[PDB]
Design a protein around this ligand. Structure first.
Ligand code: LBV
Length: 319
């Protein structure tokens, strides 16, 4: 049962310390990570309402010039499909995904979801060979299916995720009923210190984070030293209230957790929820020693692997 959040910093809210960090409003930071661009749009008209300040770098033109244009004008070949894919009232975790061409090498990956009457559009560069087929997940199901018990399933799952991603460290972090956690399986680069069997306090993943991770199953920090980029305007004009960014992997990470990562020597972090009968059972928690952007198709593969593992855990715990 999480505490109510305090206002964010840009609404004059308090600075976040170790005494009050269960109240940080981590879903509404008003800013994104700088490896991509974000726009928000009205869900019926398509009118562009908010843009990240770096939008020109990715889109080829200025925020001041794109704001107020409609997606029917800007994205004539995707706007109908996007509308159809995310009708009003659909789940905020449902996504639309398209690949677009741009001035530069590779393409732009476009990911869109709906929160209330607002469409949230994320653009991130992707290379062409950075395609992942459905075989990656398909072939991986095999070793997960043959694991004979829960711990063997956890060990195969961390090894499969490390093989798919190349991450330096991949853990399965399981929550206890008091919300403390334990690393129950770990695949890691030879010579990295082991976290296997280590337990952590509940405060390391505070209650409002555990709530958010029950609904939006994947989040990441691509570069634990990168400054966030503001959305402008920072509040959603539809509501004159903060924009919920829980559903956007580009959402800026809590500064408090960015510090926690830098203290562990982590350059890039990503985790996928394992949700069992609607409760958060644990996380697939990954680190890399340097900044790294896992490509969008691999992320989506990992999400699916989390849902598959959640079912296999749920099967075995009933035994
Ligand atoms: C006073 C507030 C604190 C707190 C804030 C906090 N932590 C998170 C998110 C995560 N914490 C994680 C914990 C671990 N990563 C590990 O490697 C290990 C053990 C080896 C642990 C225990 C994890 C996995 C996450 C999820 C995100 C990720 O995978 O990188 C947040 C929310 C971050 C966000 O989504 O914006 C917050 C606010 N951590 C503290 O320790 C105290 C200081």
């Amino acid at each position: 049962d999480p505490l109510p959040f305090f206002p964010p910093l840009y609404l004059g809210g308090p600075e976040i310390t170790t005494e009050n960090c269960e109240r940080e409003p981590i879903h509404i930071p008003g800013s994104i990570q700088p490896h991509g661009a974000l726009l928000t749009a009205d869900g019926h008209s398509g009118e562009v309402l908010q843009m990240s300040l770096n939008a020109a770098t990715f889109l080829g033109q200025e925020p001041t010039v794109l704001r107020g244009q409609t997606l029917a004008a800007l994205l004539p070949e995707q706007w109908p499909a996007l509308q159809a894919a995310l009708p009003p009232g659909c789940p905020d975790a449902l996504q639309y995904r398209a690949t677009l061409d741009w001035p530069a090498a590779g393409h732009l990956s476009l990911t869109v979801h709906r929160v209330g009457e607002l469409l949230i559009l994320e653009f991130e560069p992707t290379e062409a060979w950075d395609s992942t087929g459905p075989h990656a997940l398909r072939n991986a199901m095999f070793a997960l299916e043959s694991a004979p018990n829960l711990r063997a399933l956890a060990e195969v799952a961390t090894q499969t995720v490390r093989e798919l991603t190349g991450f330096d460290r991949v853990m399965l972090y399981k929550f206890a009923p008091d919300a403390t956690g334990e690393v129950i399986a770990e695949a890691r680069r030879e010579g990295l210190h082991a976290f296997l069997g280590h337990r952590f306090p509940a405060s390391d993943i505070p209650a409002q984070a555990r709530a958010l991770y029950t609904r939006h199953l994947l989040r990441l920090t691509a570069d634990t030293r990168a400054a966030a980029v503001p959305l402008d305007p920072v509040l959603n004009p539809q509501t004159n209230a903060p924009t919920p960014l829980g559903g956007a992997v580009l959402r800026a990470t809590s500064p408090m957790h960015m510090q926690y990562l830098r203290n562990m020597g982590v350059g890039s972090s990503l985790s996928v929820s394992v949700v069992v009968g609607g409760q958060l059972w644990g996380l697939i928690a990954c680190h890399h020693q340097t900044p790294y952007v896992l490509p969008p198709d691999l992320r989506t593969t990992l999400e699916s692997l989390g849902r598959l593992l959640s079912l296999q855990v749920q099967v075995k715990e009933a035994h």
